[PDB]
Write a protein that binds this ligand. Sequence first.
Ligand SMILES: O=S(=O)(O)CCCN1CCN(CCO)CC1
Length: 170
Amino acid sequence: GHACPSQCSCDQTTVKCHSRRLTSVPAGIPTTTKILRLYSNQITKLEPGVFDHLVNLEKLYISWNQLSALPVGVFDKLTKLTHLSLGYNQLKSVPRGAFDNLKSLTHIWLLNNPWDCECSDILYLKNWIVQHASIVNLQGHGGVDNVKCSGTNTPVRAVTEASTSPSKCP
Ligand SMILES: O=S(=O)(O)CCCN1CCN(CCO)CC1
């Protein structure tokens, strides 16, 4: 069954693509998928729309990669998502409104990214983690104060807008 990507193992609605030295999200993840494990790989980029067919997805683990950014709208179709891990990546910000369609989210992991607290792109993440602090970095991952600024390890929630500039941005 090539409904299952050759690089992953598919246990009904649970797709195991983790710990497989992958450099991109495999194409053809089955639309039945409720749990997608993509953690512990060599992914640096997500293609725009890569998850859009996974309308049933409840858990998305993409921690322990080298993701340098998120495309605009990449989570917008995942309206059933309860769990999202982005920990242990190379993210400097997330696009404005990245989480806004994730109305069912109960758990997010954002620790151990080089969040760029000098750049105004940080402000959506800062406001969002203050608003949704109770779901951030749960299960012994250090909570909302473990979303930390690159270089200083100051909690992102402590960043004042007056500390940021659009001109210190990529
Ligand atoms: O993915 S991270 O390492 O950033 C955070 C780990 C999150 N895991 C918590 C425990 N569950 C399993 C037990 O509930 C899997 C996800």
